[PDB]
Amino acid sequence: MKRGFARPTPEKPPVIKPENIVLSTPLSIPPPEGKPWWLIVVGVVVVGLL
Amino acid sequence: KVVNSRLRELGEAPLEATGRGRWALCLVDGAPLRATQSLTEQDVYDGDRL
């Protein structure tokens, strides 16, 4: 002998929510700008030699 | 009788006691069942332990 059991309407499961994400783009390396170092080096010598 | 018979096949000593009293079925708390009423009248169902 067993106890009776009637299955009711199923209870609500927790809802899943998708998400679409687009990644950021990496930074770009700064191109190599360059100073005319030798020019200012001759300068302080000339003004000094005077 | 069948429990004592089965116990010997398992190699266990049969149920035995000394003093004035009687043998009966009990619940996990030690409360004995009613001797004159049906198991269907009591709250007993398949898979219970006694």
Swiss-Prot record, chain A:
Signal peptide: none
Phenotype caused by lack of the gene: Mutants are defective in the secretion of EsxN, PPE41 and PE_PGRS proteins.
Residues that span the membrane, as ranges: 38-50
Residue numbers of the full-length protein present here: 1 to 50 of 1391
Gene name of the encoded protein: eccC5
Record text on subunit structure and interactions: Part of the ESX-5 / type VII secretion system (T7SS), which is composed of cytosolic and membrane components. The ESX-5 membrane complex is composed of EccB5, EccC5, EccD5 and EccE5.
Localization per record: Cell inner membrane
The protein, known as: ESX-5 secretion system protein EccC5
General remark: Part of the eccB5-eccC5 operon, which is essential for in vitro growth.
Entry function: Part of the ESX-5 specialized secretion system, which is responsible for the secretion of EsxN and a number of PE_PGRS and PPE proteins, including PPE41.
Domain of life: Bacteria
From Swiss-Prot, chain B:
Signal sequence region: none
Disruption phenotype: Mutants are defective in the secretion of EsxN, PPE41 and PE_PGRS proteins. Mutant is highly sensitive to detergents and hydrophilic antibiotics such as ampicillin, vancomycin and bacitracin. Virulence is attenuated both in macrophages and in the severe combined immune-deficient mouse infection model.
Compartment list: Cell inner membrane
Biological function: Part of the ESX-5 specialized secretion system, which is responsible for the secretion of EsxN and a number of PE_PGRS and PPE proteins, including PPE41.
Family according to the record: Belongs to the EccD/Snm4 family.
Anything else known: Was identified as a high-confidence drug target.
Quaternary structure annotation from Swiss-Prot or TrEMBL: Part of the ESX-5 / type VII secretion system (T7SS), which is composed of cytosolic and membrane components. The ESX-5 membrane complex is composed of EccB5, EccC5, EccD5 and EccE5.
Protein name: ESX-5 secretion system protein EccD5
Protein species of origin: Mycobacterium tuberculosis (strain ATCC 25618 / H37Rv)
